[PDB]
Design a protein around this nucleic acid. Structure first.
Ligand code: MG
Ligand code: MG
Ligand code: ZN
Ligand code: ZN
Ligand code: ZN
Ligand code: ZN
Ligand code: ZN
Ligand code: ZN
Ligand code: ZN
Ligand code: ZN
Ligand code: ZN
Ligand code: ZN
Lengths: 505, 131, 505, 131
RNA sequence: GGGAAAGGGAUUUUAAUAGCUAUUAAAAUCCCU
RNA sequence: GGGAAAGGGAUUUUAAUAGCUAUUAAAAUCCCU
């Protein structure tokens, strides 16, 4: 074929092409040399040396397939499984000026971590002895909306420093989350061009100091290392690339993000655009369309947290069922319809937004449906509603707590990843205005076989003593409650709840 | 602005070489796996009466060779990346490269795989005689 | 003799002192053991083990003098000599609660680079086998103004990570400026307590990889390195400490800073307080009281920049004097009263704010004195005035350009350090509303002995040609002008300046 | 809240030890330069009838020694910093230290400079006899 | 913090124990949190 | 930028060359800057 592309375009102002001995391609040769049979000839003309022509990097395509080389432009399904590696990425660039016209170079890189890196205008220059990656003339884009880019032309640093700073920032962010990096971009045409400055690709490699996958490459050492061992490393090794615009969005980034989020408003900068891009990707992959079959690997005591959550749920649901004389229980948000507790004989009912069993009715809960369930105890274990009823028992993840299985999400909410990904709305204390924070306490009925605390509702505490069995149970329940609360979960209860009603046993 | 230089068919491999740590190994793996070799090389019309050395300042191909522009058969000039040679200077730019006719399919692969003899300036195993 | 101090205070809730074999001091022993002659006795009582007592770190005093150990709490003059090492420092802390009462621990560290680090509450705990630096219970300070500290209690990271992040940030900031670090604090009582977590002191050391002074210490490697070799280092080595409040200020930080600056307004955070502290220190040391005798060492191409500035000043002043045929010249801002150019015979007058010679009159310029000098040509070479006259030739440093010899300053201005420290007000284009930006050009009169340009006002360019002498003169002047402009200087001239009047020679 | 523990005279040396990389060298240099030794040590009233070993669970001073509380004569307990010993456990805490009367001026310097013999548990050069 | 026992210092004044000072306890002003 | 020669792509339409396509040139819409 003969379809030309804008990649490696000669951006110099010279009208005549190069001599055959210097031109990189056939179509870059001057027409005075070309002859029949698509051949070139040496006319013994004087050599036009020295020269300096800027070469464009616009239009990279990482779609080749080589055995042993990973696929970097991953699809939707593969990007969902790598959600812990998601780092937003935006670039603002400057147009080449003076001796060069027809290319853009990166000026301000921004990431979802909120950092911005300003760089000097650096491009590829082809000279009579080879090529360099050196400073070129560049001006900020014209128009009103890019006036804020005018000062940034004189605030940029050298590229080798910015490379190490970017690697250090990505190491600080993604070390505990994954061995991978995934740049979530809104338009990859310029993002990939900018990534050519600070990224290297190749075969899958092992870290020199440990068994983790190598995610950074050092050029002076010619070495590979993971995030923990990437001190002083220039380049990021094998990053995945994701384009949100390929996922069926129409219009610019701002109008698509403002339809689903109101928290990321602010001044225009590359990092804020990156944050909006990542927020829109999260909304696309975990709110609009939800996949329940994708399990995520355990990285830090998820099983113990699940066991502690089940223990705390059993204790507080039993206590809420026994403190008040409730004979009818509604469970709004049970996907399977399995009763949490069965020691108090009560009439259970189950509802869910997407039930997995016909025994569970469908219920997309709205605050106007409070009167439908006003005669029983409502249960909201990890079920999020903007306005809870009066008689509820609610467990909700506080999105403001920094956790390893907690990730930033959409509209101020958070993505909680524990064997599955759940999007949780932003923790607002106004939703629980009709409820009170549930105080810490323990309740048990186990037989009896020092510890002084008034919240241990047991048979021994009625007589002012404590036994070994209840002491060990109380200590392990304190450990479970501490793990659940330090993970981020908050428990709320109906106003008329009093622990002193539990002393009847 | 500017003028186009490369075909779209070469845009894939040249992107890969622009990102790989080892461009030569990556290009050789791409070619050996069945991928298309780099097209758009500068081919010179010669009367086939030259001496036959590897790299020369003017075309010197024999009957069993073809003359190519050096910058068009150097992978680091095609991809516009930093040369690994001494002091960063390309050995091919400004000079014409002789390629044997039996390897006319992939000039870049031949120029990456072979190396001229330092004594007689012919291709080793392809015209060099130093016994 | 027996003055007690709050340092190492036992912050536990135990009402009795320790046993003599476990107590660290005499006065921490329980009174049942002490005797009349200030002796202690063993009463063979059962040991109260195990135990866990929080120990306060409030009240460090680094005033000891040991040979070979540098003085860290430097004075005013030494702080001025080390202005390139100035990093602001503020700490917001949390009060110890529950098992502890009577100490504070760092919660949010903030630096003048705009960086905040949030840490988990960690304090010293004395136990029956020794002591630990481990997590303790702590609550945010009460009151309204500290409500913003309530979320930060659950957003903090571990101290060994924050140490490396702080060292990395300081290495990124202070690498090209100095081999030293100088924490500029507003109240060092808590800043030094927080610095005990991430700083180490000792004899002055040399970097393991080069000859620079060692500014960071690594504990796992047990090694010392400077800023360039401090990758993975977790401690800052030998930092100087400066207290702004000791310099005669009365009142809190906000009221003192708001009297001299209006740019650093914003929300309350540790980094903004650090920025205000550094701004107030800069105002104290370089605006109010100024020392002209303190000379700073050269870093890079400062002598070259001075030579280029002198060349550009000579050319511009000569051309501006010859154009318009001015006869009287006023030089507002010449400390010595030395004429810049003397080829055109004009009547020179000199003024300065602090003249060094009786031949120079005092002039603290104000725009109301515009008519006082309206009958000549005014000169403002590195003289900063909020409103310039209509007949001016001005050279002013643009404070928005990043440079090695450019440091952040007061009220949006900058400190320019080139053999001397000058405080420059913030670059505002509104001061130049009566002036036009001076276009680049060259002028010469040297005898003669390709290059196409319409701004090289010479004898050859009148006839459309150019000679080798004027070619190399023009090229070296282009290099000088490029260095001057890239350093940050901007040139402005009176409106009626036309370069075409210079063709008369 | 809390109760005070240290005198102001020891605050400078204890802060210096808290900040230094090597507390032992810093304290020895501070003492040898003429600085005041650490005061406020716990001194024990004994009938001077003990065996005389270095570290013991009960006071054992002879006529030529004085018994001190161990935690009060360990520099790392006085400064509340991490101990360098095996597994971070102090060897002086919970036990009484015998100090010779000729070195009663600076117990901390004696406990830093000298170590007990592992065979007879006496101070080497100050009561140990193993020749 | 989700978590009963609300923090550190400087100056002045007051009262007590001991042989004017050290400590203890309180009030007022200022700084840090 | 302090600095004469205002950037990249996708879709549709039009004109020209050569034997419906590739390039060149222009207009409209959208995205990036
Ligand atoms: Mg953007
Ligand atoms: Mg503050
Ligand atoms: Zn590793
Ligand atoms: Zn958003
Ligand atoms: Zn019991
Ligand atoms: Zn080459
Ligand atoms: Zn040979
Ligand atoms: Zn070094
Ligand atoms: Zn300020
Ligand atoms: Zn001339
Ligand atoms: Zn100890
Ligand atoms: Zn012995």
């Amino acid at each position: 074929s003969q379809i030309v592309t804008g990649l490696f375009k000669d951006c110099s102002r010279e009208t005549s092409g190069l001599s055959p001995a210097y031109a990189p391609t056939y179509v870059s040769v001057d027409d005075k040399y070309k002859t029949s049979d698509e051949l070139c000839v040496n006319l013994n003309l004087p050599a036009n040396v020295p020269y300096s022509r800027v070469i464009s990097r616009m239009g990279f395509k990482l779609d080749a397939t080589v055995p042993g080389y990973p696929k970097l432009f991953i699809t939707r399904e593969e990007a969902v499984r790598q959600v812990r590696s998601w780092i937003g990425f935006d670039v603002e660039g400057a147009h080449a000026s003076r001796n060069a016209c027809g290319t853009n170079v990166p000026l301000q890189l921004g990431f979802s971590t909120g950092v911005n890196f300003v760089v000097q205008p650096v491009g590829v220059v082809d000279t009579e002895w080879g090529n360099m990656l050196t400073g070129i003339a560049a001006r900020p884009p014209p128009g009103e909306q890019f006036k804020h880019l005018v000062p940034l032309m004189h605030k940029g640093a050298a590229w080798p420093i910015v490379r190490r700073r970017i690697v250090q920032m990505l190491s600080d962010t993604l070390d505990k989350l994954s061995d991978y990096c995934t740049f979530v971009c809104w338009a990859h045409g310029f993002a990939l061009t900018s990534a050519s400055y600070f990224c290297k690709i190749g075969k899958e490699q092992k870290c020199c100091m440990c068994n983790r996958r190598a995610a950074a490459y050092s050029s002076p050492l010619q070495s590979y290392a993971c995030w923990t061992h990437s001190c002083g490393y220039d380049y990021v090794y094998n990053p995945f690339f994701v384009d949100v615009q390929q996922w069926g969005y129409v219009g610019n980034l701002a109008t698509n993000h403002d339809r689903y989020c109101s928290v990321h408003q602010g001044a225009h900068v590359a990092s804020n655009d990156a944050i909006m891009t990542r927020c829109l990707a999260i909304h696309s992959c975990f709110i609009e369309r939800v996949d329940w079959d994708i399990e995520y690997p355990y990285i830090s005591h998820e099983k113990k947290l699940n066991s502690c959550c089940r223990i705390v749920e059993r204790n507080v649901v039993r206590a809420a069922l026994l403190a008040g004389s409730f004979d009818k229980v509604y469970d709004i948000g049970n996907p399977k319809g399995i009763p949490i507790v069965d020691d108090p004989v009560v009439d259970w009912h189950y509802f869910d937004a997407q039930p997995l069993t016909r025994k569970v009715q469908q219920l997309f809960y709205t605050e106007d449906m409070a009167s439908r369930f006003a005669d029983g105890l409502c249960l909201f274990w990890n079920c999020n509603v903007p306005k809870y009823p009066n008689n509820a028992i609610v467990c909700r993840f506080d999105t403001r707590v920094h956790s390893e299985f907690n990730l930033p999400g959409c509209d101020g909410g958070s993505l909680y990843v524990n064997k599955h990904a759940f999007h949780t709305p932003a923790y607002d204390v106004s939703a629980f205005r009709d409820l009170k924070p549930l105080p810490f306490f323990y309740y048990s009925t186990t037989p009896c076989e020092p510890l002084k605390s008034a919240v241990c509702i047991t048979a021994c505490n009625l007589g002012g003593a404590v036994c070994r069995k209840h002491a060990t149970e109380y200590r392990e329940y304190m450990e479970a409650y501490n793990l659940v609360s330090a993970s981020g979960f908050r428990l709320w209860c109906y106003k008329t709840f009093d622990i002193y009603n539990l002393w009847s046993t | 602005a500017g003028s186009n230089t490369e075909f779209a068919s070469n845009s894939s491999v040249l992107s890969l070489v622009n990102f790989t740590v080892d461009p030569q190994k990556a290009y050789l793996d791409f070619v050996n796996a069945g991928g298309a070799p780099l097209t758009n090389c500068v081919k010179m019309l010669t009367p086939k009466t030259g001496t036959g050395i590897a790299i020369s300042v003017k075309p010197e191909s024999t009957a069993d060779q073809e003359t190519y522009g050096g910058a068009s058969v150097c992978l680091y000039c095609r991809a516009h990346i930093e040369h690994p040679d001494v002091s960063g200077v390309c050995k091919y730019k400004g000079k014409f490269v002789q390629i044997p006719a039996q390897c006319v399919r992939d000039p870049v692969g031949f120029c990456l795989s072979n190396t001229p003899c330092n004594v007689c300036q012919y291709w080793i195993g392809y015209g060099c005689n130093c016994d």
